[PDB]
């Protein structure tokens, strides 16, 4: 059906993905799953600040000998002006192939997979009804040739939160 190579929900422990800047942008915070289960998430909402360029690249992800790899993202995005007009309702998803599973820095190095957007956002907290305003975007990465890769997330001023990040390849 789908062989997973990564699921942020079931990696246990702390996620500890490297982010630039280390703080002030993407921050790894916890939450209570829609189905309660405690998960680790990433987020940033520097909507009121200028020149946003917050990066968050995962860790080494092996392609386990696969060519095309699918990326399943589950973000939320709070409606910007629900806070004290023009609103960033997207972000960019990048990637980088590598046989080295200990890259410790790594932008121009990265390749943009697509400008991803939120079909739905929210104004109030979780009060609104209950919820499944949880966007889930699916993306494909071209033919691969190396051992693994890294996934990069670039914020540019949107009040977004990444609830889940899953990757697999379909056998």
């Amino acid at each position: 059906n789908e062989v997973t190579l990564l699921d942020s929900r079931s990696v246990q422990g702390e996620l500890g993905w490297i982010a630039s800047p280390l703080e002030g942008g993407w921050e790894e915070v916890s939450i209570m799953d829609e189905k309660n289960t405690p998960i680790r998430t990433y987020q940033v909402c520097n909507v009121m600040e200028p020149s946003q360029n917050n990066w968050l690249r995962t860790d080494w992800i092996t392609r386990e000998g696969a060519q095309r790899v699918y990326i399943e993202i589950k973000f939320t995005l709070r409606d910007c002006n629900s806070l004290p007009g023009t609103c960033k309702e997207t972000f960019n998803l990048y990637y980088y192939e590598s046989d080295n599973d200990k890259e410790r820095f790594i932008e121009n190095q990265f390749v943009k997979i697509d400008t991803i957007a939120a079909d739905e956002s929210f104004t109030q907290v979780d009060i609104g009804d209950r919820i499944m305003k949880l966007n889930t975007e699916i993306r494909d990465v071209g033919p691969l040739s190396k051992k693994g890769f890294y996934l990069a997330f670039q914020d540019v001023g949107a009040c977004i939160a990444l609830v889940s990040v899953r990757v697999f390849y379909k056998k």
Binding site: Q12, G13, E14, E23, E27, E28, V29, S30, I31, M32, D33, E34, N36, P38, R40, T41, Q43, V44, C45, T76, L77, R78, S82, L83, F122, V125, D126, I131, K133, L134, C159, I160, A161, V163
Partner: protein, 138 residues
Amino acid sequence: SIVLEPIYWNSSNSKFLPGQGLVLYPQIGDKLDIICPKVTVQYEYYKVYMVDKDQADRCTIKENTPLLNCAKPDQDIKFTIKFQEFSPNLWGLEFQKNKDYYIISTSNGSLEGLDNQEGGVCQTRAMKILMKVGQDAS
């Protein structure tokens, strides 16, 4: 900055001033880690919840869900709280400056009484955490 210094939820933690729990003065933006470490190899079973002043005082528990289900003795259990008013995440906690938030546990500490809805560890060791968001210390 922001990273507030982890808070191990374990009876040996001296910071839990017996009879008054541990009091904090976290501000907006502050990040905090409640940790339930592994084992070495005696582990204290807990079910940590966040409750209102009512349930905080006269330790009782009730749809009242655990932020920490410390019950996995081989690995670390942890919930990283982010002291933000407006949450970028819909399922994420939110706070307000000048309000108190309480985190207690009514477990015996043992696996036996992990679901006790009354008193427990809190009542005894005084394993409560009072957070006075955006407030100083008298």
